[PDB]
Amino acid sequence: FFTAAPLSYNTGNSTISLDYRSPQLRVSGGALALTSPVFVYQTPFNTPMRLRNGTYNEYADAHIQMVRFGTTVLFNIDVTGETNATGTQTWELQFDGTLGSCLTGRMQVMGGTGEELDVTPTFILPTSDKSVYKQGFMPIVCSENGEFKQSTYCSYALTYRLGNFYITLKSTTSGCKPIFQMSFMYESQIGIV
Amino acid sequence: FFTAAPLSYNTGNSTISLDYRSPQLRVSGGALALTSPVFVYQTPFNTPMRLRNGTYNEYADAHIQMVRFGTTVLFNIDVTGETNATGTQTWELQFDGTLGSCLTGRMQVMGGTGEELDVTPTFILPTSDKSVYKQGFMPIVCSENGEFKQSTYCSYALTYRLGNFYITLKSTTSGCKPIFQMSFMYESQIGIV
Amino acid sequence: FFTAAPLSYNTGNSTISLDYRSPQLRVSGGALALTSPVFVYQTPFNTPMRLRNGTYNEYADAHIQMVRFGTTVLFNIDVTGETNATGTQTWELQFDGTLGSCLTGRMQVMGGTGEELDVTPTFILPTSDKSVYKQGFMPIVCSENGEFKQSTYCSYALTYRLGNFYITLKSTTSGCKPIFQMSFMYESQIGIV
Numbered sequence A, B, C: 001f002f003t004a005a006p007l008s009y010n011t012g013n014s015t016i017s018l019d020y021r022s023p024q025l026r027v028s029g030g031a032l033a034l035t036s037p038v039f040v041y042q043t044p045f046n047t048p049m050r051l052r053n054g055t056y057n058e059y060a061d062a063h064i065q066m067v068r069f070g071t072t073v074l075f076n077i078d079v080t081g082e083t084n085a086t087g088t089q090t091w092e093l094q095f096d097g098t099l100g101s102c103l104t105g106r107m108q109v110m111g112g113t114g115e116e117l118d119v120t121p122t123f124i125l126p127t128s129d130k131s132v133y134k135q136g137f138m139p140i141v142c143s144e145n146g147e148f149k150q151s152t153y154c155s156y157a158l159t160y161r162l163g164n165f166y167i168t169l170k171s172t173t174s175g176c177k178p179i180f181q182m183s184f185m186y187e188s189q190i191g192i193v
């Protein structure tokens, strides 16, 4: 028989092989995998996460995507608060510091096929040694039903406590509902192998 | 003959197979594919789209990239307006509601190779058979020739009711040209299979 | 013997093949590769680059990621300035115009596995023929130790000078340290082949 590329036949030892570009593809436990696969940990379709502003009776819906490109994580959140507010709201997400599972609400690893993947979400975790400093602010615009309300900001802060990973967001509003989209990037040293 | 990993020969049923990591690779109609491929639907290299501000005699050039990963679309637009304006401009993009093809201007599915891909861009559509309306605002900075002009805002709006798919952007300016970059994210329930 | 999908045997030319979806995977030089692979050029984990505000005695630490998907680059920077300032600071990154290698400080092509890849970072270069003038502004928020300081802006400019590729960023502050994260997107006409 013949082998068409990318299959090749080594006459020197009667071996059929798959040739692949190693920076892009790899072998892991005898199976073909990607060097830099895209993995997304997200809230499901039509299932936003319910969040509470600390101890207040102020709630919001949040759609969340955490996207792994190489070793970077792109974090996106879309928040729809139900209370008009003047102050700073704290929207806190907790994740198991070993497995990555979201403790705050329902998230899942989702393929581009639209199907849930049976994958433990360690890939969102910054460090295997459970320490991290990262904080900053992003500019945001709050609106409601297509109407501009306020140009303001939202902080983000990555921490560990009690061995779990926290992403704490804080939005500042003046007489408007916290309804906004914000994203930022961070780095993971957890390898996908 | 022999097989080297990730290929595998089964002497039991005399079958040669490819072993692959299922959360990263898959089979689609007998062919190897990715579980989470990156696709980009964009204006061609150095071929910005012409956009008209409603019925006004006011135009802009636009470079657009719509980057699909997992089930998320990252929309990025580079708008270069030509008329100094005070008011709100409306930039409307229209896409075929079934195929995703841009009707407002020329866009192509572009691989990392730099080659156009022969792919129907259904992966930018938010849904196939569910009416959709989603709006938000992002902060922007208008500039001209490297010089700051105004910190302001642009709304985005996704509309669909089983005709065409619309992305409607509204920039608000005060005595400057609408010249800005802006991105936002949205979900597509169209699986890539 | 039998072949299991995605392997197939053409009874006719006695050839065994790997079937694959061409918009997702491809063959280059007889080797399997991706059509739109993810590559990331970045500062090493916990090894920020040292930058200077032009000739002033004002410095910043910078974490940088340059994410290539399709032909688009997502540039992200986390700038941690050390000196309170009122004015506009200039932060300049310089890259070899042929190979893409960062000349300002150490950066590396990092796979999803957490391993450095042996690849030339040409995939960050905007134009093959060394003529480009992409510039714009992004809104940013300066903070310190998790406290808000200022809503402001930062320009970006992609140029070539003396055969090398420059990304020049200019942050404008009023009585605060230049401490912010910012991102922007641009197009690379260098195909990954």
Ligand SMILES: CC(=O)N[C@@H]1[C@@H](O)[C@H](O)[C@@H](CO)O[C@H]1O
Pocket (backbone or CB within 6 Å): A053, A056, A058, A083, A084, A085, A086, A087, A088, A089, A090
């Ligand atoms: C209805 C209302 O104003 N609620 C806000 C609340 O959103 C914020 O978390 C808090 C502390 O800043 O201040 C309250 O006044």
Ligand SMILES: CC(=O)N[C@@H]1[C@@H](O)[C@H](O)[C@@H](CO)O[C@H]1O
Pocket (backbone or CB within 6 Å): B053, B056, B058, B083, B084, B085, B086, B087, B088, B089, B090
């Ligand atoms: C020349 C000028 O200012 N044109 C603006 C236009 O850009 C805006 O779309 C419209 C409605 O707000 O108001 C017009 O007057």
Ligand SMILES: CC(=O)N[C@@H]1[C@@H](O)[C@H](O)[C@@H](CO)O[C@H]1O
Pocket (backbone or CB within 6 Å): C053, C056, C058, C083, C084, C085, C086, C087, C088, C089, C090
């Ligand atoms: C200490 C201080 O204010 N330094 C700023 C400097 O950051 C800026 O690059 C320069 C040009 O605007 O102006 C100086 O006043």
